[PDB]
């Protein structure tokens, strides 16, 4: 039935995890057709059992079959690359920590102590727990780095970064966005703020250990906040934007860059943000409402299409 297969949606994620996490998918580079008999001899993977997984992956549209051999579909070519954001995504998606968070989601809907399903499962909020877990921190940071790399070219296209001199990326993680921007727009002052136990090192990037809930370093003419606000409540989002308004002078600009809620796209990410952070997906007008409450005004708006989501690009200045 359609209902029992909907209940069993998890099996699709688990099948992809087995295929990608083992590195079996790396044998499918460059659109090659793989003979599972040959793959078994060199890799040691069970012929009969991996062939049955491949049949399920064909059903899913991950693999295509010809002459009893399997290739990756064009869409799923990314699974052959272990450095692809999709590879890091599947490693996190059904990991034990995420699974235990999802099992607390039901109970989390009845509590009002401001603890996410993740915190209920782990005893600390997501980013505080990641401080003590290499697997989660390295894979999450790697995922954010890959998606940052993918948006750079379009971001440099739609907005002229050459007009700015002092640039701070707030919650910029490993700093991939400004590292790539600094290679195209050379000779500016580039800074990245995040929570660092050990400072990253990269040519002409000033890495700052900080906390955007407490304070944003003042004196920059361009601030960037990319994919941060969806990890936070309305009240915490207003606090962050208030801290920007206090850091900014009349000539300063804040680029609020975020995946945006659109009716046509899936609500699944909105639920994941609830589970991990008590966060949420927001529309443009919802972001604008928070910014207006924080004492910021929209000067410019654009849409950036990415394969996986639409993005809101909102240029903010103090009222």
Ligand X SMILES: Nc1ncnc2c1ncn2[C@@H]1O[C@H](CSCC[C@H](N)C(=O)O)[C@@H](O)[C@H]1O
The catalytic residues are 230
In whole angstroms, give the CA distance from residue 208 to residue 197.
11
Cβ proximity to Na ion, 46 vs 215, nearer residue = 215
Does 234 participate in binding ligand QPO (rule CB under 6 A)? no
Stretch that binds ligand X, among 59-67, 109-117, 221-229, 282-290 (CB under 6 A): 221-229
CB 222 within 8 A of CB 300: no
CA distance 247 to 50: 56
* Residues 164-203 contacting ligand X, CB under 6 A: 171-173, 194-195
* Nearest in space to 210 (alpha carbons), one of 223, 225, 195: 195
Could you say whether residue 152 binds ligand QPO (CB under 6 A)? no
| Least Å from the CB of residue 6 to its own copies | 6
- Report in angstroms how near the CB of residue 175 gets to its own copies at its nearest: 24
> Is 75 near its own copies (CB under 8 A)?
yes
Other CB atoms within 10 Å distance of the CB of residue 141:
16
Residue list 54-73, contact with its own copies (CB under 8 A): 55-56, 59-62
224 phi/psi in degrees, rounded to 5:
-125, 130
CA–CA separation, 139 and 146 (whole Å): 11
Of 127, 170, 140, 193, which Cα lies nearest the Cα of 258?
Answer: 170
- Residues in 50-109 that interact with ligand QPO by CB under 6 A: 89, 92-93
Q: Which does 37 bind (CB under 5 to 8 A by kind): ligand QPO, ligand X, Cl ion, none?
A: Cl ion
Among 39, 144, 241, 291, which residue interacts with ligand X (rule: CB under 6 A)? 144
Site for ligand QPO, residues 299 to 318, rule: CB under 6 A: 308
Indicate whether 209 belongs to the interface with Cl ion (CB under 5 A). no
Binding partner of residue 86 among Na ion, its own copies, ligand X, none, CB cut-off 5 to 8 Å per kind? its own copies
Token pair belonging to 36:
């599972």
Q: Which residues pair with 168 in a beta bridge?
A: 191, 223
* Cα gap 238→10, rounded to integer Å: 36
Q: Choose, by CB under 8 A, the member of 272, 291, 304, 314 that binds its own copies.
A: 272
Helix (H) or strand (E) holding 127: helix 126-130
279 binds, among ligand QPO, Cl ion, ligand X, none (CB under 5 to 8 A by kind): none
33, 127, 129, 308: which one contacts its own copies (CB under 8 A)? 308
Q: Does 2 bind its own copies (CB under 8 A)?
A: yes
- x/- map, 145-184, its own copies, by CB under 8 A: ----------------------------------------
Neighbouring C-alpha atoms within 13 Å toward the C-beta of 196: 18
* Dihedrals phi, psi of 148, to nearest 5 degrees: -65, -45
Kindly report the backbone phi and psi dihedral angles of residue 60, in degrees, each rounded to the nearest multiple of 5, phi listed first. -70, -25
Given the complex with ligand X, which of 77 and 180 has the nearer CB atom?
A: 180
Does position 221 bind Cl ion by CB under 5 A? no
Q: Two tokens at 155? A: 């971001």
Angle 128-130-134 from CA coordinates, rounded to 5°: 150
Among 21, 174, 206, 270, binds Cl ion (CB under 5 A): 206
Closest of 183, 177, 260 to residue 223, by C-alpha: 177
**Which residues of the chain form contacts with ligand QPO (CB under 6 A)?**
89, 92-93, 143, 147, 227, 259, 308
**Which residues of the chain form contacts with Na ion (CB under 5 A)?**
215, 217
């Amino acid at each position: 039935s359609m209902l029992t297969e909907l209940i069993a949606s998890n099996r699709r994620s688990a099948a992809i995890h087995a295929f990608v996490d083992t590195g079996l998918s790396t044998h499918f580079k460059d659109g090659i057709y793989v003979d599972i008999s040959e793959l078994s001899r060199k890799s040691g993977v069970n012929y009969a059992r991996f062939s049955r997984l491949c049949d399920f992956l064909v059903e899913m549209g991950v693999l295509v079959s010809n002459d009893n051999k399997f290739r990756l579909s064009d869409e799923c070519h990314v699974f052959a690359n272990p450095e692809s954001f999709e590879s890091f995504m599947i490693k996190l998606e059904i990991c034990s920590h995420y699974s235990n968070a999802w099992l607390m989601y039901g109970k989390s809907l009845f509590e009002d102590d401001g603890k996410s399903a993740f915190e209920m499962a782990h005893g600390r909020p997501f980013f505080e727990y990641l401080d003590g877990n290499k697997f989660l921190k390295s894979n999450f940071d790697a995922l954010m780095t890959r998606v940052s790399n993918l948006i750079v070219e379009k971001l440099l296209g739609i907005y002229d970064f050459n007009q700015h001199n002092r640039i701070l990326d707030v919650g910029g993680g490993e700093g991939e966005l400004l590292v790539r921007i600094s290679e195209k727009v050379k000779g500016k002052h580039y800074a990245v703020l995040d929570r660092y136990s050990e400072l990253p090192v990269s040519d002409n990037i000033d890495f700052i250990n900080g906390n955007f809930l407490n304070s944003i370093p003042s004196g920059y003419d361009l601030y960037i906040l990319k994919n941060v606000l969806h990890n936070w409540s309305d009240s915490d989002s207003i606090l962050i934007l208030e801290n920007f308004r206090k850091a900014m002078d009349k000539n300063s600009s804040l680029l609020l860059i975020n995946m945006v809620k659109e009716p046509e796209f899936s609500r699944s990410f909105d639920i994941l943000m609830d589970v991990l952070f008590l966060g949420k997906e927001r529309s443009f007008t919802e972001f604008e409402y928070l910014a207006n409450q924080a004492g910021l005004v929209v000067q410019e708006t654009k849409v950036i299409d990415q394969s996986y989501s639409p993005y809101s690009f909102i240029k903010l200045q103090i009222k």
